Amino acid sequence: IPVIEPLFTKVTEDIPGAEGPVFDKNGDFYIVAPEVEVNGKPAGEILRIDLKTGKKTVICKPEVNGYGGIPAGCQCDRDANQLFVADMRLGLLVVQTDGTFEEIAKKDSEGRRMQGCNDCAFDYEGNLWITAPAGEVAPADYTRSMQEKFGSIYCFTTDGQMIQVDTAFQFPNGIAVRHMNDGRPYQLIVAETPTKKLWSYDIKGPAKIENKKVWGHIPGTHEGGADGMDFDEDNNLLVANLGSSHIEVFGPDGGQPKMRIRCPFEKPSNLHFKPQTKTIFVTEHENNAVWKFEWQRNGKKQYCETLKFGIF
Ligand SMILES: [Ca+2]
Ligand SMILES: [Ca+2]
């Protein structure tokens, strides 16, 4: 497997559990620090990083009824400049740039208690596909599916429904949606970290996925595996293989990566493209820092980069 070694440039440092890199509709960059703790208890943070300097500002330190959150993944909304955040303790949150937030669901569409979330991906129809590797949200004692198969997948729909679309995953992690050239959502990709597998489903409609399949295989037997993921404009899927020192690049059809990206660290965690550029910001857990490097092309446009009232 061909490996490229592009130049990684430091962006910012000291972000405990540096995760969920995201750009909003204004080009502002954000990162979540899930692993920040206060006297042993969760106290995760949502930060805005000035790219010109690397200076950090925590806009939100989410807590519900005394229970601190573990914000781990992000997606920027389209119709409003707000961030949808997957929280390992609080479920799904919507955070405003002013730092205020709202817990989205205590329970799902079926009345079952919500599970902690880790990452999410907006399809072009506005539906949010979310991974839930943790057990029940706070106040429930924290648990996570790193060993046992209790990780679930949800689809938070445009009509406000938190629908569990699948269960029994061993730490569902990264997630991405593949679109047809005309913008129609047709395939969901979900990373199952420890098993070294990438799973795929056919998206038949909002919250409707079928034909579960082992779509791709992650290199290595190291502890870790597929974490964050995203598509480039040609639909190649770049996946952070935590513990491998590489970001795998899968072609449109999956299988084995067709190329690997060597990182100057062992734990790449998540990534995100800077809109309209080949620049990919990468978070890692070795130094708890954020970096950025140049990929071969622009990333696939995120939902926030699409237009509600566009003509073409
Ligand atoms: Ca993750
Ligand atoms: Ca991303």
Q: What is the 3-state secondary structure (H, E, C) of 41-93?
A: EECCEEEEECCCCCCEEEEECCEECCEECCEEEEEECCCCCEEEEEECCCEEE
Closest CA to 102 of 36, 180, 40, 160: 160
Is 241 among the annotated ligand-binding positions? Answer: no
SS3 237: strand
Tokens of residue 220, six digits: 């290595």
Q: Is 73 exposed, middle or buried (0-12, 13-18, 19+ CB in 10 A)?
A: buried
Is 287 among the annotated ligand-binding positions? Answer: no
CA distances from 143 to 38, 46, 136, 178 (A): 19, 22, 8, 30
For the chain, the maximum distance between any two Cα atoms, rounded to a whole number of angstroms, is: 53
One-letter amino acid of 293: F
Which one of the ligands is nearest to 228 CA? 1
Return the bridge partners of 164, or none.
Answer: 154
Length of the chain: 312
8-state DSSP, 140: S
Q: Is 1 exposed, middle or buried (0-12, 13-18, 19+ CB in 10 A)?
A: exposed
Task: Select 1-312's CATH number: 2.120.10.30, 3.30.420.40, 3.40.50.300, 1.10.3720.10.
Answer: 2.120.10.30
What are the residue numbers of the active site? 285
Distance from residue 254's CA to the centre of ligand 1 (Å): 20
Which one of the ligands is nearest to 122 CA? 2
Q: Is 223 exposed, middle or buried (0-12, 13-18, 19+ CB in 10 A)?
A: exposed
Can you tell me which residue has the tokens 């955070």? Answer: 95
What is the resolution of the experimental data for this entry, in Å?
Answer: 1.9
Q: How many CB atoms lie within 10 A of CB 32?
A: 33
Tokens of residue 247, six digits: 């970001």
φ and ψ at 303, to 5 degrees?
Answer: -55, -40
This entry's atomic model was obtained through: X-ray
Closest CA to 11 of 228, 275, 272, 299: 272
Return the bridge partners of 48, or none.
Answer: 30, 57
CA dihedral 93, 267, 55, 95 (to 10 degrees): 0
Residues with CB under 5 A from ligand 2 (ion): 230, 272
- Contact between 104 and 89 under an 8 Å Cβ cutoff? The reply is no
Tokens of residue 44, six digits: 């995760």
One-letter amino acid of 50: D
